[PDB]
Amino acid sequence: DVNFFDELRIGLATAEDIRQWSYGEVKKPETINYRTLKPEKDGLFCEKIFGPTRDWECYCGKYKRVRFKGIICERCGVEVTRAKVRRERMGHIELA
């Protein structure tokens, strides 16, 4: 990632661009569970949308090892990469 790129362009974000960024819709208004500290599905911290809480650890707990790198879990819908993606994966709310 070199440090020479000429222009930085800004423009209006189409409602279709918002969906192009979003890794899923934030349906429920909940955040997490106040016992297990696990975020509720489709919430504001959903791991299916934004990313895993811990590195290579899914929500349902089936995939916790590094050997399953890049697998989309079928039972909880969470990808298995590092938690660094929770700083860059965007969500979106679809308005009625």
Binding site: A15, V26, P29, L44, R89, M90, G91, H92, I93, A96
Partner: protein, 292 residues
């Protein structure tokens, strides 16, 4: 002024429809983190309460649309969804802001970029830096104009990785791992090694407010006992520094280019004149002029 707005949408090729949103983006969670407290409870960013209020009212609107509720409830609901997204993007812009617990205005997304506390001025124009320190300044008459006296304990932590490198070269430490434990424990060998490290390696001294460029000057470090920074009496005019409790910051240039910029461009002995007027600054000023 109307053409100024319309012509931009005409030439650019982007539709003005973007000003009306059908979907709102959600910032990633780590930029709006929710931390746990030592009392068992939690604490989340205000952006989460704004996103949560948009979600709450948008789902209620979906219920009213499904139920065929009277148009007065649906319209009064759609108004609140407008105010919620308006609060998420810029709370307080229109009308009275959405108060949190304790009548405190919630911080919107645009509040992350505004003013002195915004992202630009707080985290982009100025940053906190590694390899730096601060201590009280003390006058040092014996020092030469290109020299400054900094405490030994400051230099050890400031030059910690360099000290660990030389501790493993001279075989005072087996590996770099134990060399780190030796610097943390301050084994007596490091004081003989640290003297070799800081040799002709310039440092930067700074006293806020940094009014002009001479508010930061380069010096040759000299290991002195005590815990205060020893400053030359002639650079006191440039820093506007009296000795009634002032503190200065020290910054260590790492790269070869950075040390060269301090050795040539920022050295105190190479900046005797004021860049604003051309008349000298490092001159006898108080006790010295009376003595002469």
């Amino acid at each position: 002024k109307r053409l100024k707005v319309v012509a931009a949408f005409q030439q650019s090729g982007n539709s003005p429809m973007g000003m009306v949103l059908d979907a709102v983006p959600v910032i990633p969670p780590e930029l709006r983190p929710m931390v746990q407290l030592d009392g068992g409870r939690f604490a989340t960013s205000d952006l989460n309460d704004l996103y949560r209020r948009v979600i709450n009212r948008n789902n209620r609107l979906k219920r009213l649309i499904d139920l065929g509720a009277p148009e007065i409830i649906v319209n009064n609901e759609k108004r609140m969804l407008q105010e919620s997204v308006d609060a998420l993007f810029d709370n307080g812009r229109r009308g009275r802001p959405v108060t949190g617990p304790g009548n405190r205005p919630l911080k919107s997304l645009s509040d992350l970029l505004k003013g002195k506390q915004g992202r630009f001025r707080q985290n982009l124009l100025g940053k906190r830096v590694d390899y730096s320190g601060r201590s009280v300044i003390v006058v040092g008459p014996q020092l030469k104009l290109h020299q400054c006296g900094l405490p030994k304990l400051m230099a050890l932590e400031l030059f910690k990785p360099f000290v660990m490198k030389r501790l493993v070269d001279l075989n005072h430490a087996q590996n770099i791992k134990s060399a780190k434990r030796m610097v943390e424990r301050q084994r007596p060998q490091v004081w003989d090694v640290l003297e070799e490290v800081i040799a002709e390696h310039p440092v930067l001294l700074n006293r806020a407010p940094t009014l002009h460029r001479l508010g930061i000057q380069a010096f040759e470090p000299m290991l002195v006992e005590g815990k205060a920074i020893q400053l030359h009496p002639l650079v006191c005019e440039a820093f506007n520094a009296d000795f009634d409790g002032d503190q200065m910051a020290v910054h260590l240039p790492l790269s070869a280019e950075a040390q060269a910029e301090a050795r040539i461009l920022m050295l105190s002995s190479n900046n005797i004149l004021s860049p604003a007027s051309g008349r000298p600054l490092a001159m006898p000023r108080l006790d010295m002029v009376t003595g002469l």
